[PDB]
């Protein structure tokens, strides 16, 4: 462990850690010593984007042969500094062009803008005075900070001409020192750590001083700084300045839609989202832009002392190069805004974004001073903001519209969540006490996020991210570290993957401190260039997911710390002035087992260890004391999160043993389970407690796994039918209804849980329940294996195929649609919305999940289908309907322009048809409600029939519309629902009965017609209460039953 002693001090590989903790005008003569160009509005081409402050323009006719010596590739564009605040320069250029402007657009509005941008003119500085010089020599400013106050503007219409350049130009000061702050503290670090550079500038230069700092920040370090200094000569000889800087593709935020046809809000024409939807999209593209990202601030915090103060998506800048035939797409990131970077550890001013704001700087920190983990909060949102954009793109972020906002509206009369609440200093906080638990598990496994998050983001990720973004300012990782795990992943993952290059990138990562310590830990060789390394790769990435888990903190904390025998959690009164306090004292000898543990009994020093800490755990040695502290805690209260664990699994089987037929378990806990457990267990917790919230954290926790492991058990099943025909034997004779051999359905639980271990490996490197889970689960995970093959594996057998669910779906949007007389929204997101919401009351089959609490696993499991795809996929049936309806009642009224008012001509995007499918459509139902017109007769009686229905933890009523003649007899009503129960969807009841009873039932002799109201249609079975009419597509449909 000879490395950990600071070896490299000023790298750009590992950067060292963050130990501890001029004027203006130097600032400002430092980065204005650029290089001056000149140029006419003649090489600027057609305008690319404009902000508050400026215009950008690319450069068509190449100039600026200050570019011709510098960087190759690299496409320039100019940007010329336009204030653009109620429309004082659009003023200013119809009184110089000539004319008089309006009265409407001067008075209030423009006059107090002017008023309060003259003042604050910095007329000190001599920049400013030789700024103003060089673009008009005939201003002095010195009377125009004067005469805006001595008396009130209104001759503007004589000082236009001057109140231009006078505003654009301080626009450009204040740009100018911007940078000039950035390449004082890249001079301050290039003389301490860097003995080649500082041989060559030091000695003699002031423009080459400065412009060899914007090469490095540019080809180095990734940032996007300022080039020179072009000075724009327009068609009437007024001289604008400007700035050259890069040009990009840029802005990694995409385009919404604004039509409400798209399912996830993008716009399908925006021009620019092409190709950010070949990179959010993809799962090997995303692990390399997840790391890409870090560089820049890593760097920036590191090497240099400034920090970046406003990150967010819309700041950072990206360059594809498609590469096609002969090469590959290498995506290039730059860091964009460097408006408020300031100095680390030095005052600050809160005036960022109120999304991306760390709740540590709400009330006060010392006076807000700049602190290194406002950045690795920004950082969290962000990168979560790209893995789940291909998926629900809104205008809104995810975790202020589904975790924060609901969250304030409830306790507290305080549901404005605006900057003006945040950054005053009298009032309730916004991030007291409830709202910082909402966003804590916003970002946990079960949460709102991550139910958004890629399918093939892998568990290491989601973990890091969840630890990034944590609202405690302690215990939160350093962007070192995640710098170090990222890359190394990313590296080892493109080894992996991929079936001359393999030494320099074996090379490239050995170089790194995070695998030099794992090799070390592991007990492993320096790795190879001519073996197979498969194994080698699966335990680095494996070592390094358990650190992420924290599991050495465990293990070295289940040999000092005890478990809190259960006769404290049932015999102790006054539960709400006790709590499970951990001493304090132990917290420092599980530090001491783990340091010996994890140094393996050699002797470092302090500053070894605290690097040691710093790389693997990413937090600072008063920072794992609260790590440490939780984990004790942890530890403590075993043997009653393990009888939580147990508690659950057995509501799991009594799920199964109620409903023989559910299709999915549906992670979220369904509110009644808590008083089951709490009354299983036989606890009694005020629900306002340190013991009270702990029990309803757990239940949740426990089900969420429970959950999981009936879904990875249900994809095993649908991924071993796809191969291994015997498998697809056994299955439809599981299926049609009869029972198959003993030996062949041994094979096929085999081939089954064969394939579990398959479908495990992708994002779990190995098993779900291998890592040490007794108090999650209720069983270890040595008896774990033998739970899932023998008890679990026999629920989840008979599954049925895709396109029943599909049709049984499509059949319960069906019944919504009548059920609810309004008409549908316009845009599909709102009917998807009512249609979805109000489905579990008014259907007679529950949905297998609820609105808002939806997955891409659950949909892709069942329907075949991702969740945009999905979504269109219901909107679709229910418009359809509506039009149907809509037809049939026109067509009873005639004895057609009577459709409802936004029917008449629709646009058939509404629909899925074609253009030339609505017009035949139409024609088939109106050819089908002649039919249901032509039932109706004298000799024919319509009615309705009970019968069992939804199965409630007994059965509910359900009743079902019937026509028959009064002719008919029991003896020709009970054959036709004989016939109707063969083709039913349950297996077992394809041979039944079919009774219709009063319960005595009914003579065979009688008369129908008479009867009808308290008979009811009963199953029974010849050789031996069921619910077995419900699952036939005659009693799921609209139209009603014909007995004939």
Same mark, same amino acid.
Request: hydrophobic fraction near 40%; proline fraction near 6%.
């Given at each position: 462990?000879?490395?950990?002693?600071?070896?490299?001090?000023?790298? $750009?590989?590992?950067?060292?850690?963050?130990?501890?903790?001029?004027?203006?005008?130097?600032?400002?003569?430092?980065?204005?010593?650029?290089?001056?160009?000149?140029?006419?509005?003649?090489?600027?081409?057609?305008?690319?984007?404009?902000?508050?402050?400026?215009?950008?323009?690319?450069?068509?006719?190449?100039?600026?042969? $200050?570019?011709?010596?510098?960087?190759?590739?690299?496409?320039?564009?100019?940007?010329?500094?336009?204030?653009?605040?109620?429309?004082?320069?659009?003023?200013?250029?119809?009184?110089?062009?000539?004319?008089?402007?309006?009265?409407?657009?001067?008075?209030?509005?423009?006059?107090?803008?002017?008023?309060?941008?003259?003042?604050?003119?910095?007329?000190?500085?001599?920049?400013?005075?030789?700024?103003?010089?060089?673009?008009?020599?005939?201003?002095?400013?010195?009377?125009?900070?004067?005469?805006?106050?001595?008396?009130?503007?209104?001759?503007?219409?004589?000082?236009?001409?001057?109140?231009?350049?006078?505003?654009?130009?301080?626009?450009?000061?204040?740009?100018?020192?911007?940078?000039?702050?950035?390449?004082?503290?890249?001079?301050?670090?290039?003389?301490?750590?860097?003995?080649?550079?500082?041989?060559?500038?030091?000695?003699?230069?002031?423009?080459?001083?400065?412009?060899?700092?914007?090469?490095?920040?540019?080809?180095?370090?990734?940032?996007?700084?300022?080039?020179?200094?072009?000075?724009?000569?327009?068609?009437?000889?007024?001289?604008?300045?400007?700035?050259?800087?890069?040009?990009?593709?840029?802005?990694?935020?995409?385009?919404?839609?604004?039509?409400?046809?798209?399912?996830?809000?993008?716009?399908?024409?925006?021009?620019?989202?092409?190709?950010?939807?070949?990179?959010?999209?993809?799962?090997?593209?995303?692990?390399?832009?997840?790391?890409?990202?870090?560089?820049?601030?890593?760097?920036?915090?590191?090497?240099?002392?400034?920090?970046?103060?406003?990150?967010?998506?819309?700041?950072?800048?990206?360059?594809?190069?498609?590469?096609?035939?002969?090469?590959?797409?290498?995506?290039?990131?730059?860091?964009?805004?460097?408006?408020?970077?300031?100095?680390?550890?030095?005052?600050?001013?809160?005036?960022?974004?109120?999304?991306?704001?760390?709740?540590?700087?709400?009330?006060?920190?010392?006076?807000?001073?700049?602190?290194?983990?406002?950045?690795?909060?920004?950082?969290?949102?962000?990168?979560?903001?790209?893995?789940?954009?291909?998926?629900?793109?809104?205008?809104?972020?995810?975790?202020?519209?589904?975790?924060?906002?609901?969250?304030?509206?409830?306790?507290?009369?305080?549901?404005?969540?605006?900057?003006?609440?945040?950054?005053?200093?009298?009032?309730?906080?916004?991030?007291?006490?409830?709202?910082?638990?909402?966003?804590?598990?916003?970002?946990?496994?079960?949460?709102?996020?991550?139910?958004?998050?890629?399918?093939?983001?892998?568990?290491?990720?989601?973990?890091?991210?969840?630890?990034?973004?944590?609202?405690?300012?302690?215990?939160?990782?350093?962007?070192?570290?995640?710098?170090?795990?990222?890359?190394?992943?990313?590296?080892?993952?493109?080894?992996?993957?991929?079936?001359?290059?393999?030494?320099?990138?074996?090379?490239?990562?050995?170089?790194?401190?995070?695998?030099?310590?794992?090799?070390?830990?592991?007990?492993?060789?320096?790795?190879?260039?001519?073996?197979?390394?498969?194994?080698?790769?699966?335990?680095?990435?494996?070592?390094?997911?358990?650190?992420?888990?924290?599991?050495?903190?465990?293990?070295?904390?289940?040999?000092?710390?005890?478990?809190?025998?259960?006769?404290?959690?049932?015999?102790?009164?006054?539960?709400?002035?006790?709590?499970?306090?951990?001493?304090?004292?132990?917290?420092?000898?599980?530090?001491?087992?783990?340091?010996?543990?994890?140094?393996?009994?050699?002797?470092?020093?302090?500053?070894?260890?605290?690097?040691?800490?710093?790389?693997?755990?990413?937090?600072?040695?008063?920072?794992?004391?609260?790590?440490?502290?939780?984990?004790?805690?942890?530890?403590?209260?075993?043997?009653?999160?393990?009888?939580?664990?147990?508690?659950?699994?057995?509501?799991?089987?009594?799920?199964?043993?109620?409903?023989?037929?559910?299709?999915?378990?549906?992670?979220?806990?369904?509110?009644?389970?808590?008083?089951?457990?709490?009354?299983?267990?036989?606890?009694?917790?005020?629900?306002?407690?340190?013991?009270?919230?702990?029990?309803?954290?757990?239940?949740?926790?426990?089900?969420?796994?429970?959950?999981?492991?009936?879904?990875?058990?249900?994809?095993?099943?649908?991924?071993?039918?796809?191969?291994?025909?015997?498998?697809?034997?056994?299955?439809?004779?599981?299926?049609?209804?009869?029972?198959?051999?003993?030996?062949?359905?041994?094979?096929?639980?085999?081939?089954?849980?064969?394939?579990?271990?398959?479908?495990?490996?992708?994002?779990?490197?190995?098993?779900?329940?291998?890592?040490?889970?007794?108090?999650?689960?209720?069983?270890?995970?040595?008896?774990?294996?033998?739970?899932?093959?023998?008890?679990?594996?026999?629920?989840?057998?008979?599954?049925?195929?895709?396109?029943?669910?599909?049709?049984?779906?499509?059949?319960?949007?069906?019944?919504?649609?009548?059920?609810?007389?309004?008409?549908?929204?316009?845009?599909?997101?709102?009917?998807?919305?009512?249609?979805?919401?109000?489905?579990?009351?008014?259907?007679?089959?529950?949905?297998?999940?609820?609105?808002?609490? $939806?997955?891409?696993?659950?949909?892709?499991?069942?329907?075949?289908?991702?969740?945009?795809?999905?979504?269109?996929?219901?909107?679709?049936?229910?418009?359809?309907?509506?039009?149907?309806?809509?037809?049939?009642?026109?067509?009873?009224?005639?004895?057609?322009?009577?459709?409802?008012?936004?029917?008449?001509?629709?646009?058939?995007?509404?629909?899925?048809?074609?253009?030339?499918?609505?017009?035949?459509?139409?024609?088939?139902?109106?050819?089908?409600?002649?039919?249901?017109?032509?039932?109706?007769?004298?000799?024919?009686?319509?009615?309705?029939?009970?019968?069992?229905?939804?199965?409630?933890?007994?059965?509910?009523?359900?009743?079902?519309?019937?026509?028959?003649?009064?002719?008919?007899?029991?003896?020709?009503?009970?054959?036709?629902?004989?016939?109707?129960?063969?083709?039913?969807?349950?297996?077992?009841?394809?041979?039944?009965?079919?009774?219709?009873?009063?319960?005595?039932?009914?003579?065979?002799?009688?008369?129908?017609?008479?009867?009808?109201?308290?008979?009811?249609?009963?199953?029974?079975?010849?050789?031996?209460?069921?619910?077995?009419?419900?699952?036939?597509?005659?009693?799921?449909?609209?139209?009603?039953?014909?007995?004939?």
């Amino acid at each position: 462990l000879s490395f950990l002693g600071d070896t490299k001090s000023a790298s $750009e590989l590992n950067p060292p850690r963050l130990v501890c903790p001029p004027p203006r005008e130097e600032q400002v003569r430092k980065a204005y010593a650029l290089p001056l160009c000149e140029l006419p509005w003649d090489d600027l081409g057609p305008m690319l984007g404009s902000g508050t402050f400026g215009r950008v323009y690319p450069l068509r006719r190449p100039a600026c042969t $200050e570019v011709t010596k510098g960087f190759v590739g690299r496409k320039f564009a100019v940007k010329i500094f336009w204030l653009k605040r109620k429309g004082m320069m659009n003023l200013f250029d119809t009184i110089s062009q000539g004319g008089t402007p309006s009265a409407e657009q001067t008075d209030p509005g423009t006059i107090a803008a002017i008023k309060s941008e003259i003042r604050s003119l910095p007329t000190s500085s001599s920049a400013f005075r030789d700024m103003v010089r060089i673009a008009d020599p005939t201003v002095d400013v010195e009377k125009i900070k004067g005469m805006a106050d001595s008396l009130t503007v209104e001759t503007i219409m004589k000082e236009a001409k001057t109140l231009r350049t006078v505003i654009n130009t301080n626009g450009f000061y204040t740009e100018v020192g911007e940078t000039g702050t950035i390449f004082t503290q890249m001079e301050k670090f290039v003389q301490a750590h860097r003995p080649e550079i500082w041989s060559t500038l030091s000695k003699a230069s002031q423009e080459a001083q400065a412009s060899k700092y914007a090469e490095i920040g540019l080809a180095d370090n990734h940032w996007s700084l300022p080039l020179a200094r072009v000075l724009v000569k327009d068609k009437n000889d007024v001289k604008h300045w400007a700035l050259l800087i890069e040009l990009f593709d840029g802005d990694l935020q995409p385009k919404t839609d604004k039509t409400g046809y798209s399912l996830d809000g993008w716009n399908a024409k925006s021009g620019g989202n092409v190709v950010l939807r070949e990179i959010f999209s993809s799962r090997e593209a995303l692990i390399g832009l997840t790391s890409k990202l870090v560089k820049p601030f890593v760097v920036m915090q590191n090497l240099y002392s400034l920090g970046h103060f406003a990150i967010k998506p819309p700041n950072l800048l990206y360059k594809y190069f498609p590469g096609e035939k002969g090469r590959a797409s290498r995506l290039s990131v730059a860091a964009g805004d460097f408006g408020m970077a300031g100095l680390l550890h030095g005052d600050m001013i809160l005036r960022g974004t109120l999304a991306f704001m760390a709740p540590e700087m709400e009330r006060v920190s010392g006076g807000l001073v700049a602190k290194p983990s406002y950045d690795v909060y920004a950082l969290a949102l962000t990168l979560a903001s790209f893995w789940t954009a291909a998926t629900e793109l809104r205008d809104h972020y995810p975790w202020v519209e589904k975790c924060i906002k609901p969250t304030l509206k409830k306790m507290k009369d305080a549901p404005e969540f605006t900057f003006l609440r945040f950054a005053s200093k009298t009032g309730p906080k916004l991030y007291e006490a409830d709202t910082i638990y909402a966003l804590s598990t916003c970002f946990a496994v079960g949460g709102k996020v991550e139910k958004l998050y890629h399918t093939g983001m892998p568990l290491l990720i989601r973990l890091k991210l969840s630890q990034m973004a944590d609202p405690e300012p302690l215990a939160r990782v350093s962007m070192r570290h995640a710098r170090f795990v990222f890359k190394a992943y990313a590296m080892l993952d493109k080894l992996l993957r991929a079936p001359e290059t393999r030494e320099e990138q074996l090379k490239q990562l050995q170089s790194l401190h995070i695998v030099q310590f794992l090799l070390f830990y592991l007990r492993m060789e320096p790795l190879t260039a001519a073996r197979d390394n498969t194994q080698s790769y699966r335990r680095l990435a494996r070592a390094l997911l358990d650190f992420a888990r924290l599991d050495p903190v465990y293990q070295a904390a289940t040999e000092t710390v005890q478990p809190l025998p259960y006769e404290f959690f049932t015999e102790q009164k006054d539960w709400q002035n006790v709590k499970v306090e951990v001493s304090g004292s132990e917290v420092d000898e599980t530090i001491r087992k783990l340091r010996t543990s994890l140094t393996r009994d050699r002797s470092l020093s302090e500053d070894s260890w605290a690097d040691l800490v710093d790389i693997m755990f990413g937090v600072s040695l008063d920072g794992l004391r609260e790590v440490v502290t939780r984990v004790v805690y942890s530890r403590k209260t075993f043997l009653l999160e393990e009888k939580i664990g147990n508690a659950v699994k057995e509501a799991v089987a009594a799920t199964y043993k109620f409903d023989p037929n559910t299709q999915l378990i549906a992670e979220d806990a369904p509110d009644r389970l808590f008083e089951v457990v709490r009354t299983d267990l036989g606890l009694s917790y005020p629900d306002d407690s340190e013991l009270g919230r702990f029990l309803v954290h757990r239940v949740s926790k426990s089900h969420t796994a429970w959950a999981t492991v009936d879904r990875l058990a249900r994809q095993a099943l649908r991924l071993a039918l796809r191969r291994e025909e015997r498998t697809r034997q056994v299955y439809e004779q599981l299926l049609s209804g009869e029972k198959p051999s003993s030996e062949s359905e041994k094979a096929f639980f085999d081939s089954v849980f064969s394939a579990v271990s398959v479908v495990s490996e992708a994002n779990y490197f190995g098993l779900f329940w291998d890592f040490p889970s007794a108090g999650l689960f209720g069983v270890p995970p040595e008896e774990m294996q033998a739970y899932v093959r023998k008890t679990h594996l026999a629920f989840v057998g008979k599954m049925w195929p895709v396109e029943t669910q599909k049709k049984i779906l499509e059949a319960a949007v069906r019944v919504t649609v009548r059920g609810l007389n309004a008409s549908l929204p316009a845009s599909l997101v709102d009917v998807y919305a009512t249609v979805f919401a109000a489905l579990p009351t008014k259907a007679p089959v529950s949905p297998p999940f609820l609105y808002g609490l $939806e997955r891409e696993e659950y949909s892709s499991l069942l329907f075949d289908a991702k969740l945009p795809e999905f979504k269109e996929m219901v909107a679709f049936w229910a418009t359809r309907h509506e039009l149907n309806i809509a037809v049939q009642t026109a067509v009873g009224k005639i004895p057609e322009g009577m459709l409802p008012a936004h029917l008449r001509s629709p646009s058939p995007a509404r629909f899925g048809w074609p253009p030339e499918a609505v017009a035949d459509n139409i024609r088939l139902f109106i050819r089908e409600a002649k039919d249901e017109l032509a039932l109706h007769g004298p000799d024919m009686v319509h009615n309705r029939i009970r019968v069992n229905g939804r199965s409630k933890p007994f059965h509910e009523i359900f009743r079902k519309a019937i026509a028959f003649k009064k002719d008919i007899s029991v003896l020709q009503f009970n054959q036709f629902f004989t016939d109707i129960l063969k083709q039913s969807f349950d297996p077992q009841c394809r041979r039944f009965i079919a009774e219709v009873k009063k319960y005595v039932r009914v003579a065979d002799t009688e008369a129908v017609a008479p009867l009808f109201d308290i008979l009811k249609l009963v199953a029974v079975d010849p050789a031996a209460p069921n619910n077995c009419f419900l699952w036939t597509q005659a009693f799921l449909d609209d139209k009603t039953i014909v007995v004939s």
